[PDB]
Design a protein around this ligand. Structure first.
Ligand SMILES: CC(C)[C@H](Nc1ncnc2[nH]ccc12)c1ccc2c(c1)S(=O)(=O)CCO2
Length: 168
């Protein structure tokens, strides 16, 4: 149903809110929720862990079956699988992990995947333990994505910094 509410409008197609992406998925019932995935779709911690646990592990079981037959994704790539109880579809997107020496330039390719969907609920790619500068990730999102993206950022201090920095 895509019933998003409480978002700050950054541009004509990018919105942001201080919220857990899992609680937003349950309230909004989006067509697409983006996962902050890794290439073997191992959803143990962070955003992926929170989404998988909200599916009661159904996301991990389906992801393991996909990897068995198809192998790992590439950094900057994506894969549409079921959204289970959270969304119609889950778009698993692999942003670069700069804390593990991956190339930050591939962050643009990661966001380009969003342009295949009219509207998406998404986390801020390559932030948290993946190490990218969160202000840089938001700029790559705004400059790359054309479709309507609702960013859920589950940390008040980071949210307040991103908004303040964007409004400079
Ligand atoms: C920057 C934080 C606040 C953000 N966490 C979140 N953002 C939105 N809903 C959330 N629910 C639970 C955590 C969570 C974030 C965004 C991207 C990201 C990771 C974390 S990660 O470290 O798990 C792996 C790389 O990708």
């Amino acid at each position: 149903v895509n019933s998003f509410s409480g978002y700050l409008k950054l541009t004509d197609n990018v919105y942001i809110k201080n919220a857990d992406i899992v609680e937003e998925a349950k309230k909004v019932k989006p067509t697409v929720v983006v996962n902050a995935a890794n290439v073997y779709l191992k959803h143990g911690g962070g955003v992926a862990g929170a989404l998988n646990k909200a599916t009661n592990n159904a996301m991990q079981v389906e992801s393991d079956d996909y990897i068995a037959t198809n192998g790992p994704l590439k950094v900057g790539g994506s894969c549409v699988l079921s959204g289970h109880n959270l969304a119609k579809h889950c778009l698993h997107v692999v942003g670069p992990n700069v804390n593990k020496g991956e190339d930050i330039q591939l962050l643009k390719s990661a966001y380009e995947n969003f342009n295949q969907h009219e509207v998406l609920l998404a986390p801020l790619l390559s932030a948290g333990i993946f190490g990218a500068d969160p202000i840089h990730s938001l700029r790559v999102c705004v400059d790359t994505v054309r479709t309507n993206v609702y960013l859920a950022v589950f940390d008040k201090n980071l949210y307040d910094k991103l908004v303040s920095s964007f409004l400079e």
